[PDB]
Structure formats: C-alpha cells, structure tokens
Amino acid sequence: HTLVWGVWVNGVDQGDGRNIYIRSPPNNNPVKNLTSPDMTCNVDNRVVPKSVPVNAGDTLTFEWYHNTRDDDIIASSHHGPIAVYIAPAASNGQGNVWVKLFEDAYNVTNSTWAVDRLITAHGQHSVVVPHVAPGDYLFRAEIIALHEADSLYSQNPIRGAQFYISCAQITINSSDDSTPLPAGVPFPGAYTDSTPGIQFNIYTTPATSYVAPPPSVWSGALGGSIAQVGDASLE
Ligand SMILES: *[C@@H]1O[C@H](CO)[C@@H](O)[C@H](O)[C@H]1NC(C)=O
Ligand SMILES: [Cl-]
Ligand SMILES: [Cl-]
Ligand SMILES: [Cl-]
Ligand SMILES: [Cl-]
Ligand SMILES: [Cl-]
Ligand SMILES: [Cl-]
Ligand SMILES: [Cl-]
Ligand SMILES: [Cl-]
Ligand SMILES: [Cl-]
Ligand SMILES: [Cl-]
Ligand SMILES: [Cl-]
Ligand SMILES: [Cu+2]
Ligand code: NA
Which residues does the annotation say bind O2? Predict the structure, then answer.
C-alpha cells in the first residue's frame, strides 16, 4: 500500500505533486485486475493541472510513501519488482504505447528484492530522461507486490499480484530526439495470467528463479536505479 508523493529532478525536489502533476488515486489500495482500465494509470486517470519540466539526460526521481511522506514506504514483507514506463501524453495511455525504461526485480548479491531496496532508499527511484521528441509525456511507475501472487486474481479475486501504479505528467523540453520512442505495449493488456512474473510463489520458489514480466527495457533507455537522491526531512 504505497503512493507517489512527488518527484525530484537532478536532486531537486519538485514539491508535493499529488493531484497536481501526479494523477493520484484517492488512496493506496492496489490494482489487481489485469484487464481493467485501472492498470493504465490507476483508478482516477484524468489530466491534472501541472506537468514537470525536464531535459533529456536529467535524473527524474519518483518518491513513494505509505501514509505520510518518508515513512516506512511500503510493508517490507511485500516483496516484488519495480518498473518505469513512458508513453506520449497524446495517447492518454491507450494503445500500444508503453515503453519500458527501467526494471529491477531480485538482486542476487545483496539478496534483496526491489521493494526492499526502495524502503532503504526512502521511497526513491530514478530514471534518466531519454532522447525522445520534445513534448508531453506520461511516466508510469509500477510496483508489484507478490505476497499473494501464488494465486491469480482472475481465478480468486481475493488474492493475486498487487499493482501500485502512478502516472506523472512530464514535459521534455530540451532533447535532440536522437532516439525517437519505439512502439509500446498496452496497459491493460501486456500482463496476462500466463505472463512470467505475475503468478509466482515467493515462499517456495527461489528468488533467483524469478523472472519479471516483459517487456524488456528499451535499448534507448539511459539508465536508472533505486537509491535515495534527496533528504525529505530537509527539502
Ligand atoms: C476486471 O475488469 C474487466 C474489464 O474492465 C471487468 O469486465 C471485470 O468485471 C473485472 N473483474 C472484476 C472481478 O471486477
Ligand atoms: Cl503491499
Ligand atoms: Cl512541497
Ligand atoms: Cl482491481
Ligand atoms: Cl482527462
Ligand atoms: Cl504527507
Ligand atoms: Cl539508498
Ligand atoms: Cl486468502
Ligand atoms: Cl539531447
Ligand atoms: Cl514516435
Ligand atoms: Cl487486457
Ligand atoms: Cl536498482
Ligand atoms: Cu499493500
Ligand atoms: Na487479499
């Protein structure tokens, strides 16, 4: 149960974005229905009044929280992967438009899931803004919690993978457009009951065997990481 508070750009806090530049839902409940329009940008998908200006090569950091800013972020138990996608704003997230910029699932050396690393990072994870066409974009951050993913929602609606989905409105100003955005996957649609990583038993299957849901990260992606970039208690 987690939500995005706002973003940082190059280590600078852009301020509380909730219902301002983040298309925030009313609470931290998960989305579970893989075929629902809620998979696109969560349950209150509408244009919000502001959009954060960035340039290609900038570091864009999502900052998540549970109940209040810089709290425990999400239950540590609730192990799973994190991804970030981009699409053009003109789509409103419809169609084959979502391109993957980042993926983290399980790290074998530290024996840590992305969710646990996120807690350590005080809710912060980042992508480097790619060299796409200048214009308006949606960046869709997605956390999948797997604690009930030994079942499928479609078969048992009281269980299933849990999706915490947040869309930020981002305006890319300076960019040479040298890696124009390729075709994307649809949400809903990309994830189905047979997709690797959707149904998994984290209690009995080794984490080293986990495979995150495709698609793979776009070759045009410029980087990203789960790591604290700024201190919320100060800025
Ligand atoms: C899941 O979403 C689909 C598409 O909107 C909808 O038809 C179906 O009723 C939903 N399932 C449940 C259990 O609400
Ligand atoms: Cl959770
Ligand atoms: Cl603020
Ligand atoms: Cl749902
Ligand atoms: Cl709208
Ligand atoms: Cl708060
Ligand atoms: Cl960190
Ligand atoms: Cl149950
Ligand atoms: Cl550039
Ligand atoms: Cl394009
Ligand atoms: Cl679908
Ligand atoms: Cl990472
Ligand atoms: Cu939860
Ligand atoms: Na449940």
Answer: 147, 162
Task: Give, using CA atoms, the residue closest to atom 4 of ligand 1.
Answer: 36
Which range of residues forms the domain containing residue 87? 2-235
Supply the Cα-derived Rg of the chain in whole angstroms: 16
**Residue among 36, 39, 152, 154 to mutate when testing ligand 1 (max atoms within 8 A of CB):** 36
CATH of the domain at 146: 2.70.50.70
Structure-determination approach:
X-ray
Please tell me the distance between residue 18's alpha carbon and the centre of ligand 6 in angstroms.
10
The finding on whether 178 has its CB within 6 A of some atom of ligand 1 is no
Amino acid at 41: C
176 is in an annotated binding site: no
Resolution (A): 1.8
Q: How far apart are alpha carbons 35 and 18 in whole angstroms?
A: 26
Nearest CA to ligand 1 atom 9: 36
The DSSP secondary-structure symbol of 218 reads P
The CB density around residue 44, as the number of other CB atoms within 10 Å, is 12
Lookup: tokens for 111:
């024996």
Taking residue 84's Cβ as centre, other Cβ atoms within 10 Å add up to: 24
Q: Is the CB of 36 under 6 A from ligand 1?
A: yes
Beta carbons of 100 and 130 less than 8 angstroms apart = no
